[PDB]
Structure formats: structure tokens, C-alpha cells
Design a protein around this ligand. Structure first.
Ligand code: GCP
Ligand code: MET
Ligand code: MG
Ligand code: ZN
Lengths: 470, 134, 86
RNA sequence: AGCGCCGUGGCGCAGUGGAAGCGCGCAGGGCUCAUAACCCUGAUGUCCUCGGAUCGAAACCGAGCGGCGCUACCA
RNA sequence: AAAAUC
């Protein structure tokens, strides 16, 4: 006769709950699979891609259970602009008796270390093999800056295809190709509509998709039939995630850095402002741990245009007040995840889409901002994301001087002007600043049909730097 | 490799055949009583029941479509106008296509809810989040 | 949003009036009333109705004809525009 | 989530502090040969619910509800 | 004056 809350609390207290991370553990013995890390912070960022109106957030809600906050009363229904973040924990059943496909289970991040197996008749306890962060990239043909920023954030991929619709969806191919542009190859194929398909039709669809992914760089892409609605074949997805995708190399031997992709202002209205919190920049940490209380600087920061039209860039210095990596504030941070670094930054810097795709460095390092950038660029044969009713899918042309091109340098979305074009290299003038740390893998999109269409990939080889003014 | 994909396809087809042996043609013929100047629908209760829709939402939809303000008697929708049966049939079909049945699946199992304050349709067999409010 | 529909109002001696409610502002209204008048030989009014909007009232009882003008002038949909029997 | 607007007798506005208003409707009648126009007649309410100063309140306030509007998705 | 139908 126990209530649901009482049963949940009993399972939580049986399983150990969520132990607090040690304040200053020995970081030379701390792998991404340690209990202090695995139980309370993500180490792998896996992201979902698919064409418009497919249920990209619904599949992640099925896997994890946490909503992406599809906001704005107009993005409620059609498309989101900002990404959809989600946390799920991969738990395997320790008893060999239960079937291997059903051994795995993705739960919410509120779960404990050892939850009991919900399978009827199984007394085993679940072991957390990994907790993974989820990134959802909107797939609309005007909003591609967010998808490329996410791809720069990405570490693992999940591609989605609809059944009853046409096999060659341009947007799914665009997402795939953009993923292989960003040095990403762990891609898993997901067919969502199997419930509304027949025995034979899904076979021709899978044949067409197999023929589709034959010449692209990624070859070993497993295919998973899922249901965002019937909520089945989820444990198989988790098993494939754990097996096929290992951890990209990441340790604590590299200097810290941050790539802020979202802006979040903690301004709970109605209450007195005598009790407020810090302004939070949501960013991916691709390298370098952070600990509770640090001095950091957003390198692009203040961008002003003086009385001559010249650009002045002041890094935004800030002391880190909190690190909302997970539901409870953590003492440290782990590379390869999304963390909300809450500093003393004024919340209006985080109110709107302002801290979108910017680069941030800890004190003791000086990431260099650049105004003119030398770029080595390679291009694809034909445009992608365009539907052609049977006539020679449009071929990507060559660049021309003095034109605006959306140059997504990792997360930074800039409209660059091409000063010169060579056989493989070009010079870009940026009206919006970008800072070059190591390589910052670039993607390029050209305005050919009104909206942007991706063209190819690029790498920074040189640049013309600007000195920050403290 | 697509070999371990057909096994999960077959398992999913098995679970569908176990769970949904049915997989609407459950639209009652609309009965429109013409009484001089008055147009009566003594069957709108059955329309609401068979379409799994609350009556007042259906009335709101009808009077957002048509330019009238009519009353309800206890179970029956009575209005004062000269309205044909074809119009009632077509508004029922439009309500079915845009509200009642899923626009991505063949299902009526959705019902009416309010997610910040707007009507946000949610299903029961599939549970997909799609919403139409006009 | 912005649905389009036409209504008929009768009068004494079988004479009738037609109203299209909701008109896109991409093309202006006087330039459209000019060519309504010739193709229809009926009087027309750009009347203001509160909480309703600008209405191009026309004489006669014509629905396929205003629709046939709509298909050519600005309308490219022929799905949102609704025809009322009455 | 926060602050602005509203609460019919079918619909709107008005009074808000002597306790049920008007027009629009609806119904009937009269005008007439006959339709509009016009002229008469009605029958519908804790004017959203719960408390309070008040001889008194639907009205003045408030402790909550429903629907609209802006801030804006507010880690 | 406004006048309508037929
Ligand atoms: N048949 C079916 N419909 C689904 C499924 N998931 C979502 N839908 C429906 O299809 C639409 C897509 O869902 P939604 O989550 O809004 O799409 P999205 O993938 O977020 C859109 P984008 O790709 O542009 O980011 C919705 O209207 C929803 O009702 C699914 O698994 N099956
Ligand atoms: C709970 S912090 C994670 C991101 C946030 N839910 C958005 O918006
Ligand atoms: Mg989304
Ligand atoms: Zn559905």
C-alpha cells in the first residue's frame, strides 16, 4: 500500500542515492569512468540529427526522460532555435540470466547508483556503465548555425530517418555530412517509423538507406529500428551506444578552455533582487577541468564599433560562482560535456542569444582574437539539403572575392567577407570577432537559394590577431 | 552492418502485432434537423463521444469556423440560421483531419490538454507532442 | 491563423451581396478594387469593421468568380480560402 | 514563473456603492395587400466563487478560479 | 426630404 513517492524514496535510499563528489580528489588517477565522475557528470556528448518534423526531442525524451523546454510559444510546435539538452544514465543488469538486449536501460539522471531491475522477476541491481549528455540540433533549412555549433560540441551521433516518407531526405544527408566534416564518425542509423510500416516496405527502405550510405566516409554505421511513441528498442540503443562508441581521448594534461553555446540569465521574477544568483553561460568544455571558484575570461566579449568603424574587443573577466554540470552543483568539471558556468556576469549578457558560440579561457592563458583569418578550404562536389525533382542536384561553385559567407568556426557563427580566393586557400575578414586557439575545425555555408546551404570544410592556418585591452 | 537491424525490426513487428491487433472509419452520419429558421443537431453528443472530444471545445471550433452564436440544450446544439448538411459534414471532416486524428499517425487516442496556457494536444497510444489551436 | 472565407447576404428581390473577410496586404486594395469593378461590373466597398478587418464588399452573388480573380492576383494557395453556401 | 484587463439575460456597453440595466438579439404582435424600415410587448442573473467594514452591495476591498495582454523560457 | 419591391 506504499505510495509512489515512498517506493521511489526507498529505491533511492537502497541504491545509495547520489554521493557528493570529493572537493579536491587526485586528478592524476581520475578517469572519465570513475564513480565520482560517472554517477554525477556526463563524459560523452551524443547528439541526435534528423529532418524537419521527425520527433528529434521525443526520441531523447524516450531515452532520458527530461524535456528540452521547447519554449517561446511558437517554438512550442514547429521548430526550436536553441538546442535541446538532456541527461540519461546507462545502467546494465548484473544478473546474467536476463537477456542481453534487455540488460541495458537508460534512466533519468536523478536515479541512484544501483537501481533495481524493473524486469518482472529480476532481483539484480543496475550498474552504471556511463552517463551521457544529449545534444539536439534543430534540422530546419534556415537554422544551421546551431547544428554546426552542436557538431563542434558533438562526440557521438544518432541519425534518424522516417519510414513512410521518401527515402532520400536531403536534411538527414546534410546533418550526416556536417558530422563527418567535424571529425566525427561514430554514427548510428535510426529508423523511427516502423510502426506505421509493413513487413516488406521497411525492407526496401533499409535497402535504399544502405545504398545511400555507401560512398561517404562513414561505413560501419549500425541501423536501429526505434519508436519515439511505443518506447521500445531503447535498451538496444543503449547497448549499441556503449559498445560501438568508445571515449574520445581526453585527460587533464591539456590547458583549460570553454566554448559557450547558450546564454542563461538567472532572474526568477517576483522575488526581491536582494536574493539573486549569478549569470550563467552554458558551454561545452572540450578540454581542461574546472573547479569550484575560478577566474576566467570570455575572449571575444565586448564588441564595440568606435567613431571610425573599427572593432574593439574586451574579454569579459568573471569569477566562477557555480558549475551546474548536473542537477546538483559539482566541485569540479570534466572535459567532454556541457556545463553551465555560473559567474558574476551581469544577466543581460546572458539574457538573449548573445553568448552564442563564443570562446572562453581560464586565467594563465591568452587565446588570440583575430580580425582577418587565413583559411585552407576543401569543398564538396554538389550542394546538399536541396530537393531536385530529377535534374542534376546543384553543384557547388567556386568562391568569389568580397562576398558574405556564413563561416561556422566551431561554435562561432560569423558572416565573413572573402578578400582573395586561391586554389585551396582564402582570406576572410570577420565583422564579428573570433579567437583561434588550436585548430578550431571550420564549416562553411553559402547563400545560393536565399537561405544558407553548407558547402565544405576548412582549417585555420594563419591569422591577423588583435590585442585584447584589459 | 544492417544484419542486427532486421532482428530488431522483426521484434518490433512482433510487439506491434501483440499490442495493436487493430492496426478511423467511426464517423457517424451527421444528422441535421432543419426546422424553418432553426438548425438543430440532436446528435452532436454522439459526435463528441465517438471522436473522443469534449463538447465545448467542439462548439468553440464550430463557432470559430462559422459566424454564429448558438445554444446547447440537454446534448443537442441548436442555432438560428439557414445552414446546410454539407457544411456540417465538411466542418466535421476538417475537425477530424486537423484536430481529432494524428497528423503523423493513424490514431484518435489524443485528447485535449493545456501545457503554458495554450491548448497542447497530447496522445495516449503514441504520446507525440503536436498542437493545433486554430 | 489569417483564414480567408466569403459570405453571402441576401436582400429584397433576390439581390445579393458578397463579402471576402481577410485580405493579404501584399497587394494594395484600391489597385485591386479597380480590377474587381471591371471584371465584375458590380459596386465594391473597402469597408472598415472593428475587430474584423478591411472588407471588399461586392454586389451580386459570385463565389467562383472572386475565387477565379484570387487565383491570379495574389492567391497561390486555394486551400485557406473557404466558400460558404448559406 | 512575474505585472496589467475581463467575468451577461443568448452578444456588447454601463452604472459601480437603494438591490437588477440598456441596445443588440430572439419570440410574438401592430403598421400593410406585402417584404424590408418603423411602432409596441416580453423571458431569461450568489453580472465568476469564498470572506470582510458596511441598515445595505452584484458595486469597496481581499484570498482563490477561468480566459485574454506584456515581460520573457527567466541555470 | 428619405420611397424602397412587382
Ligand atoms: N508517427 C510519429 N510521429 C511522431 C513521432 N515523434 C514525433 N512525431 C510527430 O511528428 C512531429 C515531429 O515531432 P517534433 O518533436 O515536433 O519534431 P522535431 O524532430 O523536434 C523537428 P526538427 O527536426 O525541425 O528539429 C510532431 O508533430 C509529432 O506529433 C514518432 O515517433 N512517430
Ligand atoms: C537544467 S540546465 C540544462 C539546460 C536548460 N534546461 C535549457 O534551457
Ligand atoms: Mg528540438
Ligand atoms: Zn499519435
Amino acid at each position: 500500500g506504499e505510495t509512489e513517492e515512498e517506493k521511489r524514496k526507498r529505491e533511492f535510499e537502497e541504491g545509495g542515492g547520489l554521493p557528493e563528489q570529493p572537493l579536491n580528489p587526485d586528478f592524476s588517477k581520475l578517469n572519465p569512468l570513475s564513480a565520482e565522475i560517472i554517477n554525477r557528470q556526463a563524459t560523452i556528448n551524443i547528439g541526435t540529427i534528423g529532418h524537419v518534423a521527425h520527433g528529434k526531442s521525443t526520441v531523447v525524451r524516450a531515452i532520458s526522460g527530461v524535456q528540452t523546454v521547447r519554449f517561446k510559444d511558437e517554438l512550442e510546435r514547429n521548430i526550436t532555435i536553441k538546442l535541446g539538452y538532456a541527461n540519461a544514465k546507462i545502467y546494465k543488469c548484473q544478473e546474467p540470466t536476463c537477456p542481453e538486449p534487455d540488460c541495458y536501460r537508460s534512466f533519468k539522471s536523478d536515479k541512484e547508483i544501483s537501481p533495481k531491475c524493473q524486469r518482472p522477476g529480476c532481483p539484480g541491481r543496475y550498474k552504471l556503465v556511463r552517463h551521457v549528455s544529449f545534444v539536439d540540433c534543430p534540422g530546419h533549412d534556415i537554422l544551421m548555425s546551431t547544428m554546426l555549433s552542436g557538431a563542434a560540441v558533438m562526440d557521438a551521433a544518432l541519425l534518424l530517418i522516417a519510414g513512410n516518407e521518401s527515402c532520400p531526405q536531403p536534411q538527414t544527408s546534410e546533418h550526416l555530412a556536417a558530422i563527418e566534416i567535424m571529425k566525427l564518425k561514430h554514427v548510428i542509423i535510426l529508423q523511427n517509423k516502423v510502426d506505421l510500416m509493413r513487413e516488406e516496405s521497411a525492407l526496401e527502405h533499409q535497402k535504399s538507406i544502405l545504398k545511400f550510405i555507401r560512398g561517404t566516409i562513414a561505413d560501419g554505421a549500425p541501423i536501429v529500428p526505434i519508436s519515439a511513441q511505443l518506447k521500445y528498442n531503447i535498451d538496444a540503443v543503449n547497448e549499441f551506444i556503449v559498445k560501438t562508441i568508445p571515449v574520445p581521448p581526453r585527460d587533464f594534461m591539456i590547458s583549460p578552455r570553454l566554448i559557450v553555446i547558450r546564454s542563461f540569465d538567472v532572474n526568477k521574477p517576483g522575488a526581491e533582487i536582494e536574493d539573486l544568483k549569478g549569470g550563467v553561460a552554458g558551454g561545452s568544455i572540450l578540454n581542461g577541468v574546472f573547479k569550484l571558484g575560478d577566474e576566467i575570461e570570455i575572449r571575444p566579449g565586448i564588441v564595440t564599433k568606435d567613431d571610425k568603424g573599427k572593432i574593439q574587443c574586451k574579454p569579459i573577466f568573471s569569477n566562477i560562482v557555480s558549475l551546474f554540470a548536473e542537477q546538483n552543483d559539482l566541485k569540479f568539471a570534466v572535459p567532454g560535456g556541457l556545463i553551465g558556468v555560473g559567474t558574476k556576469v551581469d544577466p543581460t549578457l546572458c539574457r538573449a542569444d548573445r553568448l552564442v558560440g563564443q570562446v572562453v579561457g581560464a586565467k594563465g592563458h591568452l587565446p588570440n582574437i583575430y580580425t582577418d583569418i587565413e583559411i585552407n578550404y576543401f569543398l564538396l562536389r554538389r550542394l546538399l539539403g536541396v530537393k531536385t525533382d530529377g535534374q542534376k542536384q546543384a553543384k557547388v561553385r567556386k568562391l568569389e572575392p568580397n562576398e558574405v559567407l556564413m563561416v561556422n568556426i566551431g561554435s562561432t557563427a560569423t558572416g565573413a567577407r572573402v578578400v582573395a580566393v586561391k586554389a585551396d586557400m582564402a582570406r576572410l575578414q570577420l565583422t564579428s570577432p573570433a579567437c583561434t586557439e588550436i585548430n578550431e575545425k571550420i564549416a562553411l555555408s553559402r547563400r545560393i537559394e536565399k537561405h544558407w546551404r553548407l558547402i565544405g570544410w576548412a582549417t585555420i592556418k594563419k591569422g591577423t590577431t588583435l590585442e585584447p585591452i584589459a | 552492418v544492417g544484419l542486427p537491424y532486421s532482428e530488431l525490426l522483426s521484434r518490433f513487428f512482433n510487439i506491434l502485432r501483440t499490442n495493436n491487433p487493430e492496426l478511423k472509419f467511426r464517423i457517424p452520419p451527421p444528422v441535421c434537423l432543419r426546422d424553418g429558421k432553426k438548425t438543430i443537431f440532436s446528435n452532436i453528443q454522439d459526435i463528441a463521444e465517438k471522436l473522443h472530444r469534449s463538447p465545448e471545445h467542439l462548439i468553440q471550433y464550430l463557432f470559430a469556423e462559422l459566424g454564429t452564436s448558438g445554444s446547447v440544450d440537454g446534448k443537442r446544439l441548436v442555432i438560428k440560421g439557414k445552414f446546410q448538411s454539407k457544411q456540417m459534414e465538411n466542418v466535421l471532416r476538417r475537425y477530424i483531419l486537423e484536430y481529432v486524428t494524428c497528423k503523423t499517425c493513424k490514431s484518435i487516442n489524443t485528447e485535449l490538454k493545456r501545457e503554458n496556457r495554450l491548448f497542447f494536444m497530447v496522445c495516449k497510444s503514441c504520446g507525440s507532442t503536436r498542437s493545433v489551436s486554430s | 491563423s489569417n483564414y480567408i472565407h466569403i459570405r453571402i447576404q441576401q436582400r429584397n428581390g433576390r439581390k445579393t451581396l458578397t463579402t471576402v473577410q481577410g485580405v493579404p496586404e501584399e497587394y494594395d486594395l484600391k489597385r485591386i478594387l479597380k480590377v474587381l469593378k471591371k471584371d465584375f461590373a458590380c459596386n465594391g466597398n473597402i469597408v472598415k469593421d472593428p475587430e474584423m478587418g478591411e472588407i471588399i464588399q461586392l454586389q451580386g452573388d459570385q463565389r467562383a468568380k472572386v475565387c477565379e480573380f484570387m487565383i491570379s492576383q495574389l492567391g497561390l494557395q486555394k486551400k485557406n480560402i473557404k466558400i460558404h453556401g448559406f
